[PDB]
Ligand binder design. Structure first.
Ligand SMILES: O=C(Nc1ccc(Cl)cc1C(F)(F)F)NC1(C(=O)O)CCCC1
Length: 135
């Protein structure tokens, strides 16, 4: 029957972005990569098979895919090519994704808010909000 992650499953398209350039700066992304990545209107496809959650992010810039089990650390290569150690957990009904590399850490939270899937990206002082709607 039902599971807490059911509300995230689906195909989602980016419909707004706030402070993403400043967040990518903080994470270490170069000028050319930020300008190009900033144009992207990614889709995000979330699916579940048993305990394995798969998230694809796809755009003209790059396609990425992660598959994971809640709470189990995994190796991820991000869109900007950081090789990170990632752990995704559910905090109530919020998917909390922590990426660690070179002694730095960034937290990405995915939540449902009305008909949207809201993505909050935090690195040190720096917060970006990316809003997706069903495709
Ligand atoms: O890969 C993503 N973003 C991104 C894009 C391009 C570059 Cl160069 C760097 C990144 C980041 F820094 F997030 F890895 N995914 C998100 C998005 O909304 O677009 C942001 C976090 C989870 C969804």
């Amino acid at each position: 029957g039902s599971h807490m992650c059911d509300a995230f499953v689906g195909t989602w398209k980016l419909v707004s972005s706030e402070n993403f350039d400043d967040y990518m700066k903080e994470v270490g992304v170069g000028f050319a990569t930020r300008k190009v990545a900033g144009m992207a209107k990614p889709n995000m496809i979330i699916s579940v098979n048993g305990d394995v959650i798969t998230i694809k992010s796809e755009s003209t810039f790059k396609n990425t895919e992660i598959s994971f089990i809640l709470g189990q650390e995994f190796d991820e290569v991000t869109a900007d090519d950081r090789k990170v150690k990632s752990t995704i957990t559910l905090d109530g009904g919020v998917l909390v994704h922590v990426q660690k590399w070179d002694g730095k850490s960034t937290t990405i939270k995915r939540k449902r808010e009305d008909d949207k899937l809201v993505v909050e990206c935090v690195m040190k002082g720096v917060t970006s909000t990316r809003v997706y709607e069903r495709a």
